[PDB]
Amino acid sequence: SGEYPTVNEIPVGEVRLYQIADGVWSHIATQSFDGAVYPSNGLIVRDGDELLLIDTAWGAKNTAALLAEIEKQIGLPVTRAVSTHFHDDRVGGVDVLRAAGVATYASPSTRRLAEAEGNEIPTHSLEGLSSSGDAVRFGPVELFYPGAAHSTDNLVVYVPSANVLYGGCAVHELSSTSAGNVADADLAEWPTSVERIQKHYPEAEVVIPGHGLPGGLDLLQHTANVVKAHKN
Numbered sequence: 001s002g003e004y005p006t007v008n009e010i011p012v013g014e015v016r017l018y019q020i021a022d023g024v025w026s027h028i029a030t031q032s033f034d035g036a037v038y039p040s041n042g043l044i045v046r047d048g049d050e051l052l053l054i055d056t057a058w059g060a061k062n063t064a065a066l067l068a069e070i071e072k073q074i075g076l077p078v079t080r081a082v083s084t085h086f087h088d089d090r091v092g093g094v095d096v097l098r099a100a101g102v103a104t105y106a107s108p109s110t111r112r113l114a115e116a117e118g119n120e121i122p123t124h125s126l127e128g129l130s131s132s133g134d135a136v137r138f139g140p141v142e143l144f145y146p147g148a149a150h151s152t153d154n155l156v157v158y159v160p161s162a163n164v165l166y167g168g169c170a171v172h173e174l175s176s177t178s179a180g181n182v183a184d185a186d187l188a189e190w191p192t193s194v195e196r197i198q199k200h201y202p203e204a205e206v207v208i209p210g211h212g213l214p215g216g217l218d219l220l221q222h223t224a225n226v227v228k229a230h231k232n
């Protein structure tokens with residue numbers, strides 16, 4: 001009823017949306033992995049009379065439910081999607097999206113990693129993002145490659161109309177004491193990559209993590225702290 005949704009308020013197999021700003025929503029779903037249940041976020045950005053989707057809802061059935069929830073709550077077509085790294089919480093559901101007419105995109109680095117590891121593969125390559133600090137425009141957002149962090153390919157997304165920074169899994173929520181799933185991370189470079197984000201988006205008003213609650217700019221410094229402390 002207005003609070004940011006968690007696993008306790010999303011009925012089994014469903015997706016919830018949360019209005020972040022005018023024309024900007026997050027999507028929240030839950031999934032099980034290695035015997036534990038986790039929430040995960042994505043983004044929806046209005047693109048005229050179409051919608052740009054950032055990240056799947058972590059699984060085929062969750063992503064079908066995402067499309068149905070968008071039709072119920074917003075009622076504009078999702079025409080394009082960008083996946084911000086190669087893991088299943090970002091690309092699992094791409095096959096559903098593609099069969100629903102959504103054009104799916106990711107960096108070439110994400111596409112190679114997804115293919116190599118057996119995850120679903122976005123159709124279209126996003127060039128111009130291969131060096132840290134690179135940025136490109138994509139409809140109503142800017143895509144930014146900060147450098148290796150949670151994964152080597154992780155991208156962040158900025159909505160300039162609303163000063164919304166979607167950090168994806170390179171950014172952790174304030175309540176996290178842990179650096180999350182670090183299996184494919186670069187803990188040594190992660191602080192430097194976060195510093196690049198902080199430098200590039202100093203006017204961000206909302207910062208959304210890949211999992212958990214949005215907040216303000218403090219999520220960036222908090223992430224650097226928890227990553228350094230994990231490494232320690």
Ligand SMILES: C[C@@H](c1cccc2c(-c3cn[nH]c(=O)c3)c(C(=O)O)[nH]c12)N1C[C@]2(C[C@@H](CN)C2)OC1=O
Binds near residue numbers: 033089
């Ligand atoms: C699909 C994704 C994944 C699965 C379950 C949990 C999380 C978490 C996570 C986030 N907040 N707090 C936590 O306790 C945990 C994060 C995150 O931190 O982004 N991601 C997760 N996976 C799987 C994996 C392992 C590797 C294959 N050997 C691919 O790596 C990864 O990220």
Ligand SMILES: [Zn+2]
Binds near residue numbers: 085087089150151169
């Ligand atoms: Zn990941």
Ligand SMILES: [Zn+2]
Binds near residue numbers: 089169211
């Ligand atoms: Zn993640």
